[PDB]
Amino acid sequence: QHEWGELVQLDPQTVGVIVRLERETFQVLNMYGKVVTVRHQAVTRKKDNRFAVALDSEQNNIHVKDIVKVIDGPHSGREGEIRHLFRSFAFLHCKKLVENGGMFVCKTRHLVLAG
16 A cells, blocks of 8 residues: 655665555656556655755755746656655656656756746
């Protein structure tokens, strides 16, 4: 069952989130922006820390829980909601897509706060 929105580290430099949970296995999204079924052991558990904060080179404050615009990348060109933040990559959520949970990561370097 696990929980939705849980982030998992697939590798020492790759991160993914859970978009579709299943009893036979859990569907996690690869930081590359892909969805692949995985097992509890094939994934890890990490609690988000409110202190986890990042500063945008444009003098902008970014938080794991905030709204930012995405202009870099093929899906960029729209605004998303910052749900999970990891290193220079943050997991954004998009209600437009529900089949894959509308979860995708972007480079905070190109992410700009709308407000």
